[PDB]
């Protein structure tokens, strides 16, 4: 792109070789405020960007009416990183460009476990999870190997992104409003790490934030 100037601590570190992966940023909870943080760390040839929806919205005005376009982006790596944008712009290309920014901010990692057969690398979600936006709520159920992605084409996409290849699913409520279904499905795949399991606990040690360690070089950064 055009030449870039970080206004973020993280941004500086990422432009240097200090933070070299998403993991570091995630592990000590910090918000991503610049999409350029994603592009630098995760190289292109792993990232994919699809537009799940583009639709007109209308706002009422006396006589003629102004119009706009909502759209969704979806983004991520098949290595277990996903992130869903949605944004609004008064023209087509506007809302498109805007979506992809927001999407790369909202990126979250994915835990994949097993069904109770352990071979290779994860093919299955570690547990049942649910996510809800509007009246729709999705129930992701873990499936045995070779099941394939058993869901509708709308979530099939969203699951392919997140590296889940074996699942069984069902939805509830009004599912024929597209937008609500997307957000729902995504909140599901978050909830994995949000749930405490015996395998994880051992009172795993914490250490200093990248920010703190690199404080000196951020001071120098400011200059």
């Amino acid at each position: 792109k055009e030449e870039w100037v970080p206004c973020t601590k993280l941004g500086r570190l990422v432009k240097e070789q200090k933070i070299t992966s998403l993991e570091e940023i995630f592990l000590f909870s910090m918000p991503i405020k610049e999409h350029q943080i994603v592009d630098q760390l995760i190289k292109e040839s792993d990232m994919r960007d699809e537009l799940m929806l583009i639709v007109p919205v209308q706002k009422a005005t006396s006589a003629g009416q102004r119009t706009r376009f909502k759209a969704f982006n979806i983004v991520g790596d098949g290595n277990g990183h996903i992130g869903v944008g949605a944004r609004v712009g008064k023209e087509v290309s506007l809302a498109i460009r805007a979506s992809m920014i927001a999407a790369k901010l909202n990126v979250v990692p994915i835990r994949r476990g097993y069904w109770g057969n352990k071979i290779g690398e994860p093919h299955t979600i570690p547990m049942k999870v649910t996510g809800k936006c509007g009246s729709v709520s999705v129930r992701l159920i873990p499936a045995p190997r070779g099941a394939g992605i058993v869901a509708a084409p709308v979530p099939k996409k969203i699951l392919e992104f997140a590296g889940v290849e074996d699942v069984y699913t069902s939805s509830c409520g009004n599912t024929r409003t597209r937008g609500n279904f997307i957000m729902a499905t995504f909140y599901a795949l978050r909830k994995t790490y949000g749930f405490l399991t015996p395998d994880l606990w051992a009172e795993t040690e914490v250490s200093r934030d990248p920010t703190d360690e690199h404080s000196d070089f951020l001071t120098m950064g400011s200059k």
Partner: protein
């Protein structure tokens, strides 16, 4: 620690942090889950350097249970004195 294979090899992207107070997994998503680092002190008021660490969850600032738990954590490690 973490998910393993039958070959014993870790499959996880990361192993999330512990909130010492509730022993629950701090998510990446929670940005209210703050890591408080206090610097220890010895005789003659010399800092040992930052050694100890606490981690608080983002579910403890939605009703401000934070203060309460920090005290029970601290007092147990002899950091805060009680009579």
């Amino acid at each position: 620690i973490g998910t393993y294979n039958e070959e014993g090899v870790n499959v996880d992207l990361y192993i999330p942090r512990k909130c010492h107070a509730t022993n629950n997994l701090i998510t990446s998503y929670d940005h209210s889950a703050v890591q408080i680092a206090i610097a220890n002190v010895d005789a003659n008021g010399v800092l040992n350097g930052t050694t100890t660490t606490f981690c608080i969850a983002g579910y403890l600032r939605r009703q401000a249970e934070s203060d309460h738990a920090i005290n029970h954590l601290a007092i147990s490690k002899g950091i805060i004195r009680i009579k």
